Amino acid sequence: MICIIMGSESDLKIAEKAVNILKEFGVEFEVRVASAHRTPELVEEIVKNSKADVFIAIAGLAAHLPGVVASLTTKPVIAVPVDAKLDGLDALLSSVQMPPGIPVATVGIDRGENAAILALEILALKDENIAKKLIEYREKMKKKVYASDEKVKEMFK
Amino acid sequence: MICIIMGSESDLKIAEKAVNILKEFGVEFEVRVASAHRTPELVEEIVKNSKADVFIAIAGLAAHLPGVVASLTTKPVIAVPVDAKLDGLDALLSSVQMPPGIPVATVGIDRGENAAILALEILALKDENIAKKLIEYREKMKKKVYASDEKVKEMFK
Amino acid sequence: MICIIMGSESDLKIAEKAVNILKEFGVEFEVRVASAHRTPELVEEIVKNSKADVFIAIAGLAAHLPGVVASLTTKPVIAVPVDAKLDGLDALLSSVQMPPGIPVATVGIDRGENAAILALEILALKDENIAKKLIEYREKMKKKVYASDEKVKEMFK
Amino acid sequence: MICIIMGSESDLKIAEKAVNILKEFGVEFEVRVASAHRTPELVEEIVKNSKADVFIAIAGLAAHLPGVVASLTTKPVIAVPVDAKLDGLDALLSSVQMPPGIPVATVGIDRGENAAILALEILALKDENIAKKLIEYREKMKKKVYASDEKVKEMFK
Amino acid sequence: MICIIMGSESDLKIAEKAVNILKEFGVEFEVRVASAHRTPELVEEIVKNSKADVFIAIAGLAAHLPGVVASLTTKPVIAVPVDAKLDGLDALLSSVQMPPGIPVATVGIDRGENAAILALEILALKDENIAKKLIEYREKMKKKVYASDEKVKEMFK
Amino acid sequence: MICIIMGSESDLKIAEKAVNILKEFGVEFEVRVASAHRTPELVEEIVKNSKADVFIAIAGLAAHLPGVVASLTTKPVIAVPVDAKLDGLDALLSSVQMPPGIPVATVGIDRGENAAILALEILALKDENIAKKLIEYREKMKKKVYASDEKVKEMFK
Amino acid sequence: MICIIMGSESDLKIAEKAVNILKEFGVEFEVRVASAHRTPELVEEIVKNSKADVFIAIAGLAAHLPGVVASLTTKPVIAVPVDAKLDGLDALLSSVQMPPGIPVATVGIDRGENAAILALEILALKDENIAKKLIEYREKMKKKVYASDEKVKEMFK
Amino acid sequence: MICIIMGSESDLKIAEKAVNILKEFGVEFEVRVASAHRTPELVEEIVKNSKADVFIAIAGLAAHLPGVVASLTTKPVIAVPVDAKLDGLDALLSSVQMPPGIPVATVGIDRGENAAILALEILALKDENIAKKLIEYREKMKKKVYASDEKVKEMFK
């Protein structure tokens, strides 16, 4: 089980990048909306009662959701910085620069897909079905690259 | 009453800048240490039971203390970004870029003194003794500037 | 009474975010346009004769309005950095990095709404009607978040 | 098993922060030095034959080690940006901004301790002994904070 | 022979800027697509067997292609940072800040044309036909500038 | 006489901002196009033979025109950084950070109008007709501000 | 006459760089200390009654002195950003990014010497004795460079 | 032949990093000092008469030396940004962001060693003795890495 928490409905586009990946691997997950600032009790309640092995927090601006989620559990918390101002430099450092003792796994700005893959790599350590799918997923990717090469090769001759 | 909360004992130097100002104006205040990440329940407990009209939160790195304090009260929360990495650019945006609805008054990096003055200006709206002291404080400052001018004037002639 | 001063008519969009909030709380306020550079005497005149307990200064670029307003009064001065160039990094530091003795409460870039809320939180210390409205305002916000959660919950099942 | 790889012996100080944490939890680990640029075959060889469930890559400058390690395994790869120039802004984005499909869990600059904790949180999903230790570790941390509060409380009275 | 390698088909626009220059000088070249992260074996294979005297690597984000290409050959490797996020500041430092011993010639962001010219200047050291064309190319450029001057001169009179 | 030099015809929009100001003050000026990189001999020739008391150089990217112009004369050289990449941060520092001995007066990015005004303020020191016009120009500006205030005043009542 | 105004006695080191240059050219000047924030009436008074043809304002942090000085006169105002925080990026943009109509000539951070030279180049337009000295000053500089070349030439042979 | 040009004697430390590399490969080279701003005629004269196949320009601040050198020759010009202010961000973009047609090969800040290696890789295309030495140089480097690994391996057991 993977729990995806959006600090705002504005993070839906990035959150769906994650969901579409999780749906392709056939894994269980939940998608929630909860503000660390506006509804601290909803976040707390979602986290403390979740059965998720991995949390994916998605927020922009002075993104404090990832940090708040991590302070409520010892499960791995992945943060996805969303660019809503200053081209994502706010949400990036606001979530990556956590203090000693309470870490947060940070991925690139708007990288919901990489957040889902990271979460699957963590689960794959216990679920061999997921590990196998990860290897196949990489193969699929090499193949798209070969196809790009083949196509471009026919371009400027 | 003014409540000063440090996210870490590393913020003491900046926190004392604030205290020394509050001591010169003869006003009531409290100085506490509480981590938004490590001890969310201590922060919550300090804020929800404080009698302070103004909160001064001082933290560095991915400073989330100011934000967490503001989400627990409707009283004015002043944040003081502390430079512990990336010359304070982290704690700055992490506290200033709050989301709509839950604001935080931000002052310059390591500006504990300006945080105390801002807090006094807020109290002065209800305490005429403080308002008077603020005006006198400004006069004192102009005088130090005149003295600098007088001194420099005698320098390169 | 709250006094909103725009350094330019270009700041109207951000200034209206503030006004709409003040109108919802039913509080007195004034909206003015005055340049710190082009009309220093109008700014001076507006500030020195205002009956406002809180000043909200809104300017972009090398925003010096907040600083100039604060140097003319001991009342709390809230600055709203407007992004007109360099994605608001100019107006941000130009108003937040004030020197010791003359502080300015800074909120996020284009955050006129947060500027109005901050101003109300200050007034609420003396006006219980405003304090009550602030608490209700927060409740309203939690409710919009719950509604977002409920809606998103029905999305990917 | 956790595999720590340093791109340079210059990363030892940060690498030891990690080791000291792993030693306190009594977990198996390896510490290696391998350059992604100078010895790509050593990195490849270390990764492809490691029995580690989690990789911790530590490099500075145009840090490409984390990325190269992640491209060689599907196991979680944690990157620790080291500040050797431009106050760590190079190694930060160079490792965090990975492309879709090949993610890297990034922690703060020089945060070797947070890298080890993150790795343990991942292992804890399969090792209950580690999960228990994580909870105890957090308790220990709250206690240091309470002690800081108690101490500071006796300071300005 | 010059070998142009794109880390992604998204770099085609910038890659064509290079090709169009190489086509005007009548020199041999190859255009390939290969990901340093997704297909490390294709990159390795392309580089180790290329007969190119100069390599032009074009990638965005945490661009690691230039670095990986340079670690596989002693031939000059020119990197072209592509702006796909953070206005190209990622790919810039990620390729320019190489470590001692394995250098990479970096040109401006999206400067595929300057990458091709740089490559020709290198070849010109051995091919006098190219050296001559470079001098003629510069003359052509001065002429476009004179024409701009002549045109603008007739503008505001 | 004022000499405006554009490093590229791409700087025309910003250059016209300057011209329109100079035309309103009725002063003599020249508008030229010359590249510091592509046509160093045209720049040299224009500068060494100009009768201008003030030079206005307008260039973007790694703007070296201002610097090159200043190294060819002892007359005041005003630089106007043009944002063509990295939101003007390149051309800004590339022209402002001159080395001791050869200064360049720098104005804001794309501020051709401020460049013309600065040039007129310099000429006004010798031409009383220009000095008078500068004072009138400022009056005109205060008046536009008063009109903005009057208009906005009628807005939210 | 040239008027140098320091916003703080902390700017003395940079201010002396300017004075030493002015003393070598044998020109009249004044050195003053006046805060735009703390003593707006002293700044106003100094500027409105100065007989200076050129003003050199030196301030750090959210440097507003240059802007305030320029709003009080039509004489050329040169700003010298002082690095007291964020390596001078605050004072730089805070003074360079002036709004249309009220320009400020900006030189590099801590470049008091370049500020004095710029001021002399302006005066030289009316004082031929200064113009001559500027040309001689440049000759002296070329000579120090030749001497560096001669010395280095004997170094690695 | 390789020509190293320093814009200032302040660049000696970085320039020697280059020389020491060139001395180890036993190749011909010259070390000169010439300012693009202060002595444009010395730079011009050095470049136009040099027999060097590769130019290495080393300058800090608003580094314009690399650009000026490249505008005087069609030979490859390598720039080494020197950090003398703003941690090298000035000299970096000032030399890397060249305009179309006149490229400059840029290496990391203070990377004189990488500048020399890049220059040798260019010469190696015509000198097989240098090509061979480059391959040996890389072997030597792998060996230092293996030695670091061996040493660290014995450290925490």
Backbone Cα Rg of chain B: 17
Six-digit token string for D114: 């947070």
Site of tokens 């945080």: B115
Collapse the DSSP code of B33 into the 3-class scheme (helix H, G, I; strand E, B; otherwise coil) and give the result.
strand
Distance from CA of B38 to the nearest CA of A (A): 7
Neighbours of H94 (CB within 10 A): 31
Neighbours of D26 (CB within 10 A): 9
What are the CA-CA distances from residue H148 to residues B48, D10, D31 (Å)? Answer: 54, 10, 11
Residue type, F58: I
Give the separation between CA H138 and CA D38, rounded to whole angstroms: 7
Collapse the DSSP code of B126 into the 3-class scheme (helix H, G, I; strand E, B; otherwise coil) and give the result.
coil
- Which residues are CB-neighbours of E75 under 8 A, at least 6 positions away? E52, E53, E54, E55, H121, H125
Give the separation between CA D21 and CA D16, rounded to whole angstroms: 8
- Which residues are CB-neighbours of B13 under 8 A, at least 6 positions away? none
Phi and psi angles of residue D3, each rounded to the nearest 5 degrees, phi first: -110, 115
DSSP E49-100: H---SEEEEEEESS--HHHHHHTT-SS-EEEEEE-SSGGGHHHHHHHHSPPT
Give the separation between CA H61 and CA F95, rounded to whole angstroms: 10
| E101 neighbors H25 (Cβ within 8 angstroms) | no
Give the separation between CA F48 and CA H45, rounded to whole angstroms: 19
Give the separation between CA F110 and CA D78, rounded to whole angstroms: 43
- Which residues are CB-neighbours of A137 under 8 A, at least 6 positions away? A25, A117, D101
Collapse the DSSP code of E31 into the 3-class scheme (helix H, G, I; strand E, B; otherwise coil) and give the result.
strand
Give the separation between CA B68 and CA B58, rounded to whole angstroms: 12
Distance from CA of B23 to the nearest CA of D (A): 9
Ordered by where they begin, the domains of chain H are 1-157 (3.40.50.1970)
Query: What is the experimental resolution, given in Å to one decimal place?
Result: 2.3
Strand extents, DSSP E, chain D: 2-6, 29-33, 54-60, 77-82, 105-106
Distance from CA of G19 to the nearest CA of F (A): 14
Distance from CA of C20 to the nearest CA of F (A): 9
Using a CB–CB cutoff of 8 Å, tell me whether F42 touches chain E. Answer: yes
Neighbour subunits, D (≥3 Cβ pairs < 8 A): A, B, E, H
- Which residues are CB-neighbours of A24 under 8 A, at least 6 positions away? none
Burial (CB < 10 A; 0-12, 13-18, 19+), residue E51, is exposed
Q: Where chain E is broken, by preceding residue (C–N > 2.5 Å)?
A: none
Give the separation between CA B43 and CA B72, rounded to whole angstroms: 9
Collapse the DSSP code of F95 into the 3-class scheme (helix H, G, I; strand E, B; otherwise coil) and give the result.
helix
| G64 neighbors G6 (Cβ within 8 angstroms) | no
Is the alpha carbon torsion for H124, H126, H128, H130 positive or negative? Answer: negative
Using a CB–CB cutoff of 8 Å, tell me whether B3 touches chain C. Answer: no
**What technique solved it?**
X-ray
| G10 neighbors G103 (Cβ within 8 angstroms) | no
H/E stretch holding G2 reads strand G2-6
DSSP F19-62: HHHHHHTT--EEEEE--TTT-HHHHHHHHHH---SEEEEEEESS
Burial (CB < 10 A; 0-12, 13-18, 19+), residue B151, is exposed
Residue F8 DSSP symbol: S
Nearest to A78 by CA among D96, B100, E63: D96
Q: Do B138 and C96 touch (CB under 8 A)?
A: no
Site of tokens 């009698």: B51
Residue F84 DSSP symbol: S
Collapse the DSSP code of H2 into the 3-class scheme (helix H, G, I; strand E, B; otherwise coil) and give the result.
strand
Residue G85 DSSP symbol: S
Q: Which of G71, G89, G122 to mutate to test the interface with F (most CBs of F within 10 A)?
A: G122
Q: Give one word for G29, left, alpha or beta, with left for phi > 0 and alpha for psi -120 to 50.
A: beta
- Burial per residue of F117-133, b for 16 or more beta-carbon CB atoms within 10 angstroms, e otherwise: bbbbbbbbbeeeebbeb
Q: Which residues of B touch A61 (CB under 8 A)?
A: 97-99
**Half-sphere exposure of residue F80, counting CA atoms within 13 Å on the CB side?**
30
Q: Which residues of C touch B117 (CB under 8 A)?
A: 101-103
CA angle at D106 for the pair D104 and D110, rounded to the nearest 5°: 135
Give the separation between CA C19 and CA B79, rounded to whole angstroms: 25
Chains D, H: CB contacts within 8 A come to: 46
Give the separation between CA A22 and CA A119, rounded to whole angstroms: 9
| C141 neighbors B101 (Cβ within 8 angstroms) | yes
By C-alpha distance, the chain C residue nearest G102 is: C37
H-type helices in chain A, by residue range?
12-24, 40-49, 65-70, 89-96, 112-123, 128-153
Q: Where chain A is broken, by preceding residue (C–N > 2.5 Å)?
A: none
Give the separation between CA H59 and CA H106, rounded to whole angstroms: 12
CA C88 to chain centre: 15
- Which residues are CB-neighbours of H154 under 8 A, at least 6 positions away? none
Phi and psi angles of residue D48, each rounded to the nearest 5 degrees, phi first: -60, -25
Give the separation between CA A46 and CA A50, rounded to whole angstroms: 6
Cα torsion through A132, A29, A15, D111, rounded to 10? -70
Kind of pairing between the strands at B2-6 and B54-60? parallel
| C94 neighbors C64 (Cβ within 8 angstroms) | yes
| C127 neighbors C101 (Cβ within 8 angstroms) | no
Distance from CA of A121 to the nearest CA of C (A): 22
Give the separation between CA G78 and CA G105, rounded to whole angstroms: 5
Largest CA distance in chain F: 62
Is the alpha carbon torsion for G157, H6, H12, H17 positive or negative? Answer: negative
Collapse the DSSP code of B26 into the 3-class scheme (helix H, G, I; strand E, B; otherwise coil) and give the result.
coil
Strand extents, DSSP E, chain B: 2-6, 29-33, 54-60, 77-82, 105-106
Give the separation between CA B124 and CA B127, rounded to whole angstroms: 5
Q: Do H33 and G145 touch (CB under 8 A)?
A: yes
Using a CB–CB cutoff of 8 Å, tell me whether E82 touches chain D. Answer: no
Chains C, G: CB contacts within 8 A come to: 90
Site of tokens 């506290």: B95
Residue type, A131: A
CB-based touch E/G (3+ pairs, under 8 A): no
By C-alpha distance, the chain B residue nearest G40 is: B142
Give the separation between CA H95 and CA H80, rounded to whole angstroms: 8
Residue G12 DSSP symbol: H
Six-digit token string for D32: 């290696």
Give the separation between CA A53 and CA A58, rounded to whole angstroms: 17
Phi and psi angles of residue H45, each rounded to the nearest 5 degrees, phi first: -65, -40
Site of tokens 């009283």: B75
Six-digit token string for G48: 């409105």
Give the separation between CA B105 and CA E35, rounded to whole angstroms: 46
CA angle at E19 for the pair E18 and E20, rounded to the nearest 5°: 95
Residues forming a β-bridge with D58: D6, D80
By C-alpha distance, the chain F residue nearest C22 is: F156
- The answer for A 93-152 residues in CB contact with D (under 8 A) is 96-98, 100-109, 111, 113-115, 117-118, 121-122, 124-126, 131, 134-135, 137-138, 141
| H43 neighbors H74 (Cβ within 8 angstroms) | no
DSSP H55-121: EEEEEESS--HHHHHHTT-SS-EEEEEE-SSGGGHHHHHHHHS--TTS--EE--TT-HHHHHHHHHH
| E105 neighbors E76 (Cβ within 8 angstroms) | yes
| B61 neighbors B91 (Cβ within 8 angstroms) | yes
Using a CB–CB cutoff of 8 Å, tell me whether E26 touches chain A. Answer: no
- Which residues are CB-neighbours of D147 under 8 A, at least 6 positions away? none
Residue type, E45: E
- Which residues are CB-neighbours of E51 under 8 A, at least 6 positions away? E1
CA angle at H9 for the pair H7 and H15, rounded to the nearest 5°: 80
Side-by-side strand order, sheet with F54-60: F29-33, F2-6, F54-60, F77-82, F105-106, G105-106, G77-82, G54-60, G2-6, G29-33
Residue type, C148: S
- Which residues are CB-neighbours of H96 under 8 A, at least 6 positions away? E92, E96, E106, E107, E108, F62, H79, H81, H104, H106
CB-based touch B/E (3+ pairs, under 8 A): no
| B70 neighbors B52 (Cβ within 8 angstroms) | no
